[PDB]
Amino acid sequence: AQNPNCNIMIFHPTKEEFNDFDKYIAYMESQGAHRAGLAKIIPPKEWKARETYDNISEILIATPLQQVASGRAGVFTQYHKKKKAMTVGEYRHLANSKKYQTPPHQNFEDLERKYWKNRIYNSPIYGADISGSLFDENTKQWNLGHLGTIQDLLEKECGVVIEGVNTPYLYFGMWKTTFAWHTEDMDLYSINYLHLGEPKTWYVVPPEHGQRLERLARELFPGSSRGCGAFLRHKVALISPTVLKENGIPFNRITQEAGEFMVTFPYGYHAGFNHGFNCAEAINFATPRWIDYGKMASQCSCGEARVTFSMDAFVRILQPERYDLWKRGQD
Numbered sequence: 514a515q516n517p518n519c520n521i522m523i524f525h526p527t528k529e530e531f532n533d534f535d536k537y538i539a540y541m542e543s544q545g546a547h548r549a550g551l552a553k554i555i556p557p558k559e560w561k562a563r564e565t566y567d568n569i570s571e572i573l574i575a576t577p578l579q580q581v582a583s584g585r586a587g588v589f590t591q592y593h594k595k596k597k598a599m600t601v602g603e604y605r606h607l608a609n610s611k612k613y614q615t616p617p618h619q620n621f622e623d624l625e626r627k628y629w630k631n632r633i634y635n636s637p638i639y640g641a642d643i644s645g646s647l648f649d650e651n652t653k654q655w656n657l658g659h660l661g662t663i664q665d666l667l668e669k670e671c672g673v674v675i676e677g678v679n680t681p682y683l684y685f686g687m688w689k690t691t692f693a694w695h696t697e698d699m700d701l702y703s704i705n706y707l708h709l710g711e712p713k714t715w716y717v718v719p720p721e722h723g724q725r726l727e728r729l730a731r732e733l734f735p736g737s738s739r740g741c742g743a744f745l746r747h748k749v750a751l752i753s754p755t756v757l758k759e760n761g762i763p764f765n766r767i768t769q770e771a772g773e774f775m776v777t778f779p780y781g782y783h784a785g786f787n788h789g790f791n792c793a794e795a796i797n798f799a800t801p802r803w804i805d806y807g808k809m810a811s812q813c814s815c816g817e818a819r820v821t822f823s824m825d826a827f828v829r830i831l832q833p834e835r836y837d838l839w840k841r842g843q844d
């Protein structure tokens with residue numbers, strides 16, 4: 514069995530290997546990359562996502578989210594308070610202000626220490642989940658706006674034609690902005706490209722050990738667990754590496770820098786934080802190996818998780834027994 518310790522793997526495809534996206538994902542899995550839940554892909558030196566980032570300041574962040582924490586430093590939840598719209602230029606200036614800017618630090622490890630020590634005492638503002646793309650239309654390789662759609666994959670594998678679309682999302686981050694512990698909708702893959710700015714640190718649990726994380730989360734968040742049998746779908750809970758280690762939960766960590774891709778694999782729980790002003794683009798995707806994970810994915814039916822139009826068909830076709838209850842949650 515390849516990669517039996519479930520380490521995060523890093524890949525350096527050549528320009529020729531960068532042509533066929535599906536084939537390269539399958540290659541990475543042949544080497545055991547999925548066992549980690551997360552992989553890094555460094556694009557060939559010949560590749561670029563677009564020519565420059567000099568003209569992005571007029572993008573609108575219609576609903577910036579202030580991430581307010583409650584709990585203790587290593588075990589907390591966050592809720593998202595909606596703020597007034599602002600442009601990317603206005604948000605960059607805010608991120609760089611004395612109130613929000615990254616503190617002086619020695620290296621990524623020192624910054625990680627400061628994040629876990631101090632995150633709860635601040636409420637950074639995240640421009641998340643903005644439909645759109647920063648890939649140039651002429652970029653033909655690993656262009657996250659030109660991937661094969663999940664609806665087309667389900668159709669190719671299973672023969673059923675379904676409604677729905679699949680488009681990318683932009684994330685504008687600042688110091689301390691945080692992504693809570695989650696897997697993707699319907700335990701899909703994700704791919705995330707860091708277009709510009711400061712790094713993003715990731716934590717991940719191997720898919721084969723995801724239920725260990727879930728059992729810890731039920732212990733640590735006991736009211737939330739009683740409210741919903743899949744409350745990590747709410748995407749609000751944080752657990753630090755120190756707490757994970759104290760409870761024996763297998764995980765790994767890695768820092769993504771500008772110009773690098775990350776792939777999350779089906780049922781790979783992940784969480785993380787931004788180091789400073791940055792912009793990422795991400796989208797979900799599927800492969801033939803996903804289908805069995807989609808059929809077994811948990812679902813939130815309490816009403817909190819509320820998701821896209823396109824998840825309807827996935828539930829309806831892959832999980833017909835759950836469909837009625839899940840849809841009641843959506844309405």
Ligand SMILES: O=C(O)CNC(=O)C(=O)O
Pocket residue numbers: 684691692703704705713777783793795796
């Ligand atoms: O970058 C972020 O805030 C969150 N991204 C992801 O969870 C992902 O790409 O799957």
Ligand SMILES: [Mg+2]
Pocket residue numbers: 568569570571572
């Ligand atoms: Mg602009």
Ligand code: NI
Pocket residue numbers: 695696697703777783
């Ligand atoms: Ni994710």
Ligand SMILES: [Zn+2]
Pocket residue numbers: 740741742743744746747813814815816817818
């Ligand atoms: Zn729920």
